[PDB]
Design a protein around this ligand. Structure first.
Ligand code: NAD
Ligand code: NAD
Lengths: 351, 351
């Protein structure tokens, strides 16, 4: 009954011990090493995930379970899945399992699951933060401060209050709903697009108006927020043509997945001023290389992939990961909303 | 009965024309020049405000009305008031009139008024954006992006969700109340201190609790927000001893006035880790010199003085300044809430 379990996390070095609940890094490995080893399982943890000769690849031929995390994602390709002779279970410590080839996982009969709900508040907070950072023009003020400069006009000419502006969320699942709730008291005109309409009473509490056809919402928005998974349909959806339909000077927030946008289409439209500003924590690929052009374009307010891995989020997704492992050892089903691929079927929000 | 009117604003140069509503700079000067010249008055506008030899000091001897603005503040000292033989009226385009020597103004019988309520939503927004930026640790992420780095752990060890944290506002007048209303859906433990308690219905809607004694509220707070005027009592109030009563690792937001804090006492407690981070738009003095130490201390999330001068704020304070000039010319009283010094008496919020 003893299994080989591999975890792939970001490496913390001297940061590992600066908070007692820092469960998300390599060194602390979700807090589950002792619990796993006491049951006779082998637990191997690494950040070394790229290429033929990395530590992860050493263990791909015989691991049983692979625990990944979106902030430092192991890319589980069709070729890796074919090499993986004993693999049965792919767990995501966090939310969003698109770093796996989900079609090849379904074709191989693998189970893919994630900790649904675990960091959705955290991302909704970070999104509202970035809307404010772009609208109110925080980044150019910070840059003046560190360079020893002082020029209020260089900031004020394009700074605005959020009050009275039109904000559209593209996707209204768990995160989009939590965002709409936090935006209610700012006094904005809220719109949303999804394949699924929110309940009548949630529309009434938030004041948010359903727009069934995405192309009708886009031109109306001063602010657009991305809030869908990375799926075969959403991949590359914000291309040259779709971005042309946005209001001139639109501010875009994207803490969903970087690859929902076409990389170069965003760069070109930022340089022309057609996108007024772009802010998010997600990139294609991750880690983002040193030369990734989103780092250097005008008006950018980016960070690395951090919003779903606050300390409070880490505690919840480590706990959910442990619960699923415990269920797995006992042959019990996970909560239904956790499955992304089960019995060869993809979950509806990814179809 | 035609008057010399002087305006002191920040200079925009090429930025002036980038927005048709950019009324807060020298070049557009609240949009009132034609209006004032058509009535036979003279309107001298300048940003040059420092020392014996600046353009402002040339007009001090014979001006009738001086319009100042907090973002680029003319320091109207006792020595200046004495030299000002014709001066009758000091108007603040924005909110907070502490850049005037208010005791010398009272002594000389000068009227001091400002545009109450004009940018209070704007600052409430900017405060909440800063709580998020400090709590969720945005600034180190931005810094890594522009330097070409990628290290998630270096940000995540210190990042938390705002949900469930304790936040205290020191002051609950116009801005403090608007902040509390916007914090409500984040699910925090909200406390406030003021000399005046809020209406019970407002306490209930926001969920904020009155703490009558300031010293009792302070050690309880993860986040402290400064929300009072700069007055004889608030000036230097956050000194070595008062900062010591704060929780270790406290995050502080101050978009009120810089001099409410002792400058070096903030530097020391930030260097020690007693203050975990400090964020605001306001400084002593302004413009802040190149070597001001708040620009360079650990964890700082500063900007120049911007939050009360968004485009939407400028439209409101330009209109309120124009309205008080019209009343002035007709011998009519300003709205009661606009007066800071009238008949040699300070307004109650400054006492
Ligand atoms: N930055 C972070 O740290 C972080 C953390 C968590 C999640 N995320 C990303 O955000 C995503 C959303 O999270 P959630 O909890 O809100 O997910 P959710 O499943 O609850 O909501 C997704 C929504 O997308 C809609 N949708 C799917 N395909 C669509 C399409 N083609 N057109 C229109 N609507 C479509 C679905 O109907 C659903 O309401 C995750 O999949 C993940 O990729 C990022
Ligand atoms: N950063 C900006 O752009 C910007 C913009 C507007 C205002 N401000 C600053 O914010 C201040 C507050 O603005 P407002 O509209 O909320 O003012 P307000 O008059 O409505 O509120 C001031 C509050 O301070 C309280 N107070 C005064 N002295 C006190 C003391 N010693 N102890 C406890 N409470 C005390 C009063 O009871 C009052 O409720 C302004 O005076 C200004 O200096 C900054």
């Amino acid at each position: 009954d003893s299994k080989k379990i591999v975890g792939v996390f970001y490496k913390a070095n001297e940061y590992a011990t600066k908070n007692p609940n820092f469960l998300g890094c390599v060194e602390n490995a979700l807090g589950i090493r002792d619990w796993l080893e006491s049951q006779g399982h082998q637990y191997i943890v690494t950040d070394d995930k790229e290429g033929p000769d990395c530590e992860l690849e050493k263990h791909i031929p015989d691991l049983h379970v692979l625990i990944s995390t979106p902030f430092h994602p192991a890319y589980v390709t069709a070729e890796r899945i074919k090499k993986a002779k004993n693999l049965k279970l792919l767990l995501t410590a966090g939310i969003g399992s698109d770093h796996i080839d989900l079609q090849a996982a379904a074709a191989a009969g693998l189970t893919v699951a994630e900790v649904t709900g675990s960091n959705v508040v955290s991302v909704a907070e970070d999104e509202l933060m970035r809307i404010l950072i772009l609208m109110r023009n925080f980044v150019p003020g910070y840059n003046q401060v560190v360079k020893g400069e002082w020029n209020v006009a260089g900031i004020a000419y394009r700074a605005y209050d959020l009050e009275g502006k039109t904000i559209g969320t593209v996707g209204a699942g768990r995160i989009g709903k939590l965002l709409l709730q936090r935006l209610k008291p700012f006094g904005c005109n809220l719109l949303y697009h999804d394949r699924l309409q929110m309940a009548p009473e949630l529309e009434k509490e938030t004041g948010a108006k359903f727009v069934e056809d995405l192309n009708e919402m886009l031109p109306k928005c001063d602010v657009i927020v991305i809030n869908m998974p990375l799926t075969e349909k959403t991949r590359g959806m914000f291309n040259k043509e779709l971005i042309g339909k946005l209001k001139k000077g639109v501010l875009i927030v994207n803490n969903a997945r970087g690859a929902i946008m076409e990389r170069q289409a965003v760069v070109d439209a930022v340089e022309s001023g057609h996108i007024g500003g772009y802010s998010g924590d997600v990139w294609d690929p991750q880690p983002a290389p040193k030369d990734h052009p989103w780092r250097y374009m005008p008006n950018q307010a980016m960070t690395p992939h951090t919003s779903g891995t606050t300390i409070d989020a880490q505690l919840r997704y480590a706990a959910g990961t442990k619960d699923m492992l415990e269920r797995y050892f006992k042959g019990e089903d996970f909560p239904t909303e956790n499955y992304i691929v089960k019995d060869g079927e993809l979950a509806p929000q990814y179809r």
